[PDB]
């Protein structure tokens, strides 16, 4: 049940003009697609706290990125869901090198151990596995957001992003045409997907939804690895190859843009994108 949102005073929101002309701003099974100047922040706060929302934040800090963290978590604690409740979840093989980061009032971190894969590649993909923490997630959070530890806020990232599932335009692909999109193209692959088939290429590096939605698209990406796997196949890019067919076949109720994850030193700043909000740390790879 939600009560009623109290007086607001803010402007009015005029019919006869689009907030952007510029990009696109609902996709075609009428999700947002989150762009600033599409959202009243100070509106969808209120709609939050009404509910006493919480939102987890998973990252993973596996062998050398353990070095990520103390920029990533101090970064969130300025722009990431600041006023609202949030439980980190950090899984590492190495919990004892986890930074002390001070955190805010009503917000938790939890130190996960996990084991380390040797293969970089096997690192990414066995995260769909290790997030589908099932019970644990139920319990303790409303939305799960799931990210990659090589990166820092820069600018609010906040409640505008919650919604049953989401996924983000990853940054260089979002003015591309599908056949371009590196999808997996190789039918013996769970992940295929054929070239006159996409909406969009999302980003293995952030995504997330209600606790459900998370644990059905992460247990769906973790069989159709094992799949690949029996099969003797590897997907072209990992476990974002599954993301991307997951979210062809299950459609996000909100696409994130590239505001959400960019590569400065990559792309630059085009004129697009008014805010860099979550952006890419300089590493060798
Ligand atoms: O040795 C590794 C390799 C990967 N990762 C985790 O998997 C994510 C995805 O890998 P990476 O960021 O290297 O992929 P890229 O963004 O460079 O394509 C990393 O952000 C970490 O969260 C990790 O912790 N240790
Ligand atoms: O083509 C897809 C790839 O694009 C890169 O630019 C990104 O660094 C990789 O992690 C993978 O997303
Ligand atoms: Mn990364």
């Not at 001070?102 to 990414?124: M, P």
């Not at 039918?187 to 997330?208: H, L, R, T, V």
């Not at 993301?243 to 062809?248: A, C, D, E, M, S």
């Amino acid at each position: 049940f939600m009560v009623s949102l109290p007086r607001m005073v803010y402007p009015q929101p005029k019919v006869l003009t689009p907030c952007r002309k510029d990009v696109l701003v609902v996709t075609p099974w009428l999700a947002p697609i989150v762009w600033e100047g599409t959202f009243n922040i100070d509106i969808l706060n209120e709609q939050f706290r009404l509910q006493n929302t919480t939102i987890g934040l998973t990252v993973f800090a596996i062998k050398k990125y353990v070095a990520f963290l103390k920029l990533f978590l101090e970064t969130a604690e300025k722009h990431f869901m600041v006023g609202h409740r949030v439980h980190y979840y950090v899984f590492t093989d190495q919990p004892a090198a986890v930074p002390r980061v001070t955190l805010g009032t009503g917000r938790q971190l939890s130190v996960l151990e996990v084991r380390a894969y040797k293969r970089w590649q096997d690192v990414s993909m066995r995260r769909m596995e290790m997030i589908s923490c099932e019970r644990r997630f139920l319990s303790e959070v409303d939305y799960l957001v799931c990210v990659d530890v090589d990166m820092e806020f820069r600018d609010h990232v906040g409640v505008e992003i919650l919604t049953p599932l989401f996924g983000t335009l990853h940054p260089s692909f979002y003015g591309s045409s599908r056949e371009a999109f590196t999808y997996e193209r190789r039918p013996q692959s769970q992940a295929y997907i054929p070239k006159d088939e996409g909406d969009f290429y999302y980003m293995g590096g952030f995504f997330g939804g209600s606790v459900q939605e998370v644990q059905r698209l992460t247990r769906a990406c973790h069989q159709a690895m094992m799949v690949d796997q029996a099969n003797g196949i590897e997907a072209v890019w990992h476990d974002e190859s599954h993301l991307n067919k997951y979210l062809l076949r299950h459609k996000p109720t909100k696409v994130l843009s590239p505001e959400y994850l960019w590569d400065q030193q990559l792309l630059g700043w085009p004129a697009v994108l008014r805010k860099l909000r979550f952006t890419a740390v300089p590493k060798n790879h």
